[PDB]
RNA sequence: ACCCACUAAUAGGGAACGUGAGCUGGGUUUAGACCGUCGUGAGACAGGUUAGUUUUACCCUACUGAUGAUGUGUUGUUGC
RNA sequence: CCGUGGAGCAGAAGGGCAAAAGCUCGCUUGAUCUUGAUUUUCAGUACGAAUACAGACCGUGAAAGCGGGGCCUCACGAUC
RNA sequence: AUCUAAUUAGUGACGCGCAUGAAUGGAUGAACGAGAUUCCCACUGUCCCUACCUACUAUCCAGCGAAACCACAGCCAAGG
RNA sequence: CCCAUACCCGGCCGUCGCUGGCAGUCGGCAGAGCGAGAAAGAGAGUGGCGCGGACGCUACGCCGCGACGAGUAGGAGGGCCGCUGCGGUGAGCCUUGAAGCCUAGGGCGCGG
RNA sequence: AGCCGGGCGUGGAAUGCGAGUGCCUAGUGGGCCACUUUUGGUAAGCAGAACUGGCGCUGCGGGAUGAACCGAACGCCGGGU
RNA sequence: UAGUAGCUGGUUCCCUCCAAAGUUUCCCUCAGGAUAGCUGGCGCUCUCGCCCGCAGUUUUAUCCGGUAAAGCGAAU
RNA sequence: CACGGCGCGUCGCGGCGCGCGCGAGCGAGCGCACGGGGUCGGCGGCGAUGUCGGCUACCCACCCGACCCGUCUUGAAACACGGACCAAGGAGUCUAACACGUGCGCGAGUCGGGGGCUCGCACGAAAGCCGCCGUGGCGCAAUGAAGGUGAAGGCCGGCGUCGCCGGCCGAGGUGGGAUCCCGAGGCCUUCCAGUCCGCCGAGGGCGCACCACCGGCCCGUCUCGCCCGCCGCGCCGG
């Protein structure tokens, strides 16, 4: 059977990319985490302190600890056909703000802001995010050019 | 073996219980037969007391009963020779004696 | 052919009381009628509350009852509960009190009725309020029975606060390995 | 009775609901409380905790008569004494206080757990606790040792 | 497998490595023994050697033969 | 003079490392005392190992800091 | 080498003896053996290659009469 | 063009759901409704002859709409299925013939 | 960081559907097959894995025959397809 | 002494409803157990006749990876 | 043409739209039917010793289908095992313990099981009663190995830089919470004034059980630090 190593199966995991070895960038440790904000887990290598177990990697989380080095954060883990909300500490080297939630942030600013605005204007204004609907009827101009023909063209081998 | 979830149990039925078991189907019959016994008793000591000797008042020898009285089983020579009953006479007439018991208070 | 699945297609819920006494099964004829032909939802719960089981209808203590009508806005109301009115010895002081029970306990039903109050039985309850306006609807701690206290997580396993079940309290029963950090582990 | 029971109703089944695969033998995992550490050992860990080793001093000739000590409670500590008595006090206004001797009714320590309504009280007690005595001292009164 | 001889030729195979209620039992493979090697020992040896009970068909079918049945009204002869 | 690691970091291998995690010196004993939480196998139980803290005593440095064993992944053991 | 037309057999020699050998006895040996092997003379249905005869059966009849065994039963080829 | 136990329409059995409806049988002492797209009163009040009218409702009952129905190991429910004995009850049955047994007779129940 | 008090409902993608929760608990712990991926093996109706579906527990129409293939899953019937 | 058997064999009426597993961990454990998983029964707390949640699905955002492919005029 | 009165018509844009009154929102009959699931107010024959009806059941024929059950098994019709046939017997029982669910009585209590009293005795070896026969069990208090200890507190006046006595009030707080309370508005008919009673209902209350979370209290243990009490001022006690 396998082994039950903590790092088994990490060497591409854990590495670091192509030419991008060395000191790690200060920005990381300059950034500011507090409590529930939703962030990602992405084990880097070079620092062995506080790393995340791999089932870890790649999975976001929710902040609802902050330590002098380090963040406890609850993720989900998915064990047979149950999933459990675990908390883990990791230091700050393994861990990056998740994008996927400002976006919506910024959506509820500005929608609150459309809604506030033409309250006293009385229209109507359009909020939930409809699906790609099916395109509408236009026309198609030719410039007085006909299309031009297009036919297979026949097998001969390159080999 | 063990079930999911329940209490650690002990029965005492490992030696041949079976042929040791003592059946009560006699209970209502030994009552019946103690009273006969006692009603006969009764009326062969014709105007004597049923129960028996008087007895004397006693405490309860441990803390847990020190606040109770009992009734012991006989009374003491001091109690007697201070009362001005013989030892040989107060059973002959009716008074539950015995030598053991001693009086520190 | 149909993709449906029947795991869960039988409701499990009581229709009828399983008790077989006569008087409680007058008193749910009564209320069915009243349900079915009130738009009010309290002669619902009421009748709901008939059907369960004993232990589903715990009794309730004097002192809850005093405690739970004492609270603003609920004067001069009716306390109705479908259990069992205990009396509650760790209290000197009872008001007056318009009660309505299936049964009261001896001394309870004394101590209300020397305070002053009245002792109402559904049926009467029925005829003051068919739909209980002005009624408190009160129940006893369900919670209250102690086989709660083996439920749950398992003992044993960390941060499990479960009682185990053992034949007798003492330093030899079930306090030295899984106890004790001293003898092999602690959980 | 045999009528209720799930035998009548196994009647026909072969098996008698015991399974055709694994049959109903005998004893499958050892008579009465065995394999405790070495095959039941994962339900008595799960489930009895600290069953196994050795913990405490032995005491020989244990009498449980000496350790005797039934408690009361202060919101218990009332009801010693029939209602005509509490009254009685209450509306009194000579200041008298009512004596409750809790040895009597068969209680030898008092400790303090409930409120005390607001009334002089004398009681006595073979051992009392140090919030049961402030309870008293507080609501107003006196503790009284006997032995 | 090999050899001798003849022959025209002395080709190769299957049928539960056809065929033990068909035979025999020489060989493997019980229990008695002997020797060599191995084992402290009881004992082991696809090593050698010697002695070692081979049961039942009257059933069904198959097959070999023997009566007979079947329609032509009953029988017989000659025949295809 | 050139030299991005093609060396070394105890050991297998992999990852990681350049005014360092490598080499050479200086000073030391955070390999110390203590309660909890968490991760890894997992039943989400132990052991083992590990991670963030917190409370004292310290070491080192000008200091920020770093350190409660070995750069990480393994080197270990219930009841009586 | 001898024995035969022909010999994995037998006998006599050879000895590097997988693994012979000295009272765990070595070698020999008259007489004996319901002991194990080879050859020769005589004799013969063992065989070429079978046939005939006798007695008791089997056969049929009178009388008398079981047992083993039996899911249901019993014609084949191929297929699955 | 042919046909599966699939699909569509219809009948019937059962299960589940609507925790559906019915105590309103309110009658010469009465007035027969609460199916109708719209949360709620056929609201109460004060001033400018012929004597008549089916069934129902063992409410543990009756009635109405939809959907659904495979099954080993196993679990549960209902049996006015069956056997033996006991307490009640049937002013029960029976020598004008009980029990038991047999039957090409008449039937009931999906089945026991 | 925790507390209070106050104001904002266009319930801020589509589609579908009542949901949550607690006890007690039997049987099971020999599996097998198929498309695709895949290890050992010359290979096997061999041995070993991943995903999904089946057979086992399952009858029905078709493949003449058939545990697994194709269609389709089942109360007792009439008509149609 | 009806000795023990994790091993064979058998295990008696009807209908209705629900309906599996041969997998995880530990065991002188491998023809067996314990424990999770899968099942059934019993319920309970609410819900609709504005709104709550949930999903073996998609959409819009946002991260995660080192297989198929490809490369050796790039490192080994 | 699912158009059809008269008016006051601005209820109005230039009339149409579209409002206010007109005993005040009451015209009636007959009849036909593609209309909330079939009726005929339509008929015809054959019936006494040879005919009528009898699903099933008795026997027989035909077409289609159709391998012998039980069992272990991934797989049974198996060239796997048990079974000639019939009758009767034949296998999850009883006791104890525990857990949980249900029904009943009583309820901070509950329970006479052992004993006794009832003229012993068909039933009756039953049933009734004991209450100063609740000893006793279980429950009402936990924790610690043990010595042992042993389950709230919140506001004002008296020395905020209060020592410390009184006045009190009383067993937390947040979120979600079935029900109940209130209630802006709203439920009709000649009009109009004007009520009663009942139903509706924005929002707002009090919030059961229960869940989650935050505090608080009791016992063991650890760290820090100060204060208080006395019959014995201490290796004391709090
Ligand atoms: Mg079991
Ligand atoms: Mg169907
Ligand atoms: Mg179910
Ligand atoms: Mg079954
Ligand atoms: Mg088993
Ligand atoms: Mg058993
Ligand atoms: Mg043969
Ligand atoms: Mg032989
Ligand atoms: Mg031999
Ligand atoms: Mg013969
Ligand atoms: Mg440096
Ligand atoms: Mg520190
Ligand atoms: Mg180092
Ligand atoms: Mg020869
Ligand atoms: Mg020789
Ligand atoms: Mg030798
Ligand atoms: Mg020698
Ligand atoms: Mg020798
Ligand atoms: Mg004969
Ligand atoms: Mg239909
Ligand atoms: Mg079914
Ligand atoms: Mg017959
Ligand atoms: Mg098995
Ligand atoms: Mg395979
Ligand atoms: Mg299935
Ligand atoms: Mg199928
Ligand atoms: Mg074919
Ligand atoms: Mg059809
Ligand atoms: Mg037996
Ligand atoms: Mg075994
Ligand atoms: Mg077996
Ligand atoms: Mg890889
Ligand atoms: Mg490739
Ligand atoms: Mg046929
Ligand atoms: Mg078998
Ligand atoms: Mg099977
Ligand atoms: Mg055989
Ligand atoms: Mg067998
Ligand atoms: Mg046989
Ligand atoms: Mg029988
Ligand atoms: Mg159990």
New interface residues.
């Given amino acids: 059977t396998n082994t039950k190593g903590k790092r088994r199966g990490t060497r591409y995991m854990f590495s670091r990319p192509f030419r991008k070895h060395g000191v790690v960038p200060l920005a990381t440790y300059m950034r500011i985490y507090k409590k529930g904000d939703i962030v990602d887990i992405k084990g880097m290598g070079t620092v062995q302190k506080g790393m995340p177990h791999k089932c870890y990697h790649g999975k976001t989380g929710r902040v609802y600890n902050v330590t002098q080095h380090a963040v406890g954060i609850v993720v989900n883990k998915q064990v047979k056909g149950k999933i459990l909300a675990k908390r883990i500490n990791v230091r700050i080297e393994h861990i990056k703000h998740s994008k996927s939630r400002d976006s919506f942030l910024k959506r509820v600013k500005e929608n609150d802001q459309k809604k506030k605005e033409a309250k006293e204007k009385g229209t109507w204004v359009q909020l939930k995010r409809q699906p790609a609907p099916p395109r509408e009827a236009h026309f198609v101009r030719t410039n007085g050019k006909e299309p031009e023909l297009l036919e297979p063209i026949p097998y001969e081998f390159m080999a | 073996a063990p079930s999911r979830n329940g209490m650690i149990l002990k029965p005492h039925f490992h030696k041949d219980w079976q042929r040791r078991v003592a059946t009560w189907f006699n209970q209502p019959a030994r009552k019946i037969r103690r009273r006969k016994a006692r009603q006969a008793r009764a009326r062969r000591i014709a105007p004597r007391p049923a129960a028996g000797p008087i007895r004397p008042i006693v405490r309860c020898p441990t803390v847990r009963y020190h606040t109770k009285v009992r009734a012991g089983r006989g009374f003491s020579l001091e109690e007697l020779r201070v009362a001005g009953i013989h030892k040989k006479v107060a059973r002959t007439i009716g008074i539950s004696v015995d030598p053991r018991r001693r009086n520190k208070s | 052919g149909v993709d449906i699945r029947h795991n869960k297609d039988r409701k499990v819920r009581r229709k009828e009381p399983k008790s077989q006494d006569i008087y409680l099964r007058l008193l749910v004829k009564l209320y069915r009628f009243l349900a079915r032909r009130t738009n009010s939802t309290f002669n619902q719960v009421v009748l709901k509350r008939l059907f369960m089981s004993r232990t589903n209808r715990p009794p309730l203590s004097l002192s809850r009852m005093i405690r739970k009508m004492k609270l603003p806005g609920r004067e001069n109301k009716t306390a109705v509960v479908v259990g069992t009115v205990t009396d509650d010895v760790r209290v000197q002081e009872v008001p007056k009190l318009k009660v309505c029970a299936l049964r009261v306990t001896s001394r309870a039903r004394s101590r209300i009725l020397k305070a002053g109050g009245k002792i109402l039985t559904f049926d009467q309850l029925a005829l003051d309020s068919p739909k209980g306006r002005g009624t408190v609807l009160l129940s006893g701690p369900r919670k209250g029975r102690e086989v709660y206290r083996h439920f749950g997580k398992a003992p044993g396993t960390p941060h499990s606060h479960t009682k185990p079940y053992v034949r007798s309290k003492g330093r030899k029963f079930e306090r030295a390995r899984g106890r004790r950090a001293s003898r092999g582990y602690k959980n | 009775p045999s009528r209720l029971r799930k035998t009548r109703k196994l009647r026909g089944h072969v098996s008698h609901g015991h399974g055709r695969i694994g049959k109903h033998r005998k004893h ?3 008579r009465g ?1 065995a394999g405790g550490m070495h095959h ?1 050992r994962i ?14 001093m032995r005491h020989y000739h244990l009498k449980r ?2 350790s ?1 000590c039934p408690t009361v409670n202060l ?2 500590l ?2 010693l004494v029939s209602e005509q008595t ?1 009254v009685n006090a209450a509306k009194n206004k000579t200041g008298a206080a009512p004596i409750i001797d809790v ?2 009714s068969g209680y030898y320590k008092v400790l303090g757990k ?1 409120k005390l ?1 607001k009334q002089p009280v004398i009681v006595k007690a073979k051992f009392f606790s140090r919030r049961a005595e402030e309870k008293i001292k507080g609501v107003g009164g006196a503790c009284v040792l006997v032995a």
């Fill in positions: 499958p995992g050892g409380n039941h339900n008595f860990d799960k489930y009895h905790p600290g069953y196994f080793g050795k913990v405490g008569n000496q005797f919101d218990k009332w009801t509490r040895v009597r409930g309504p």
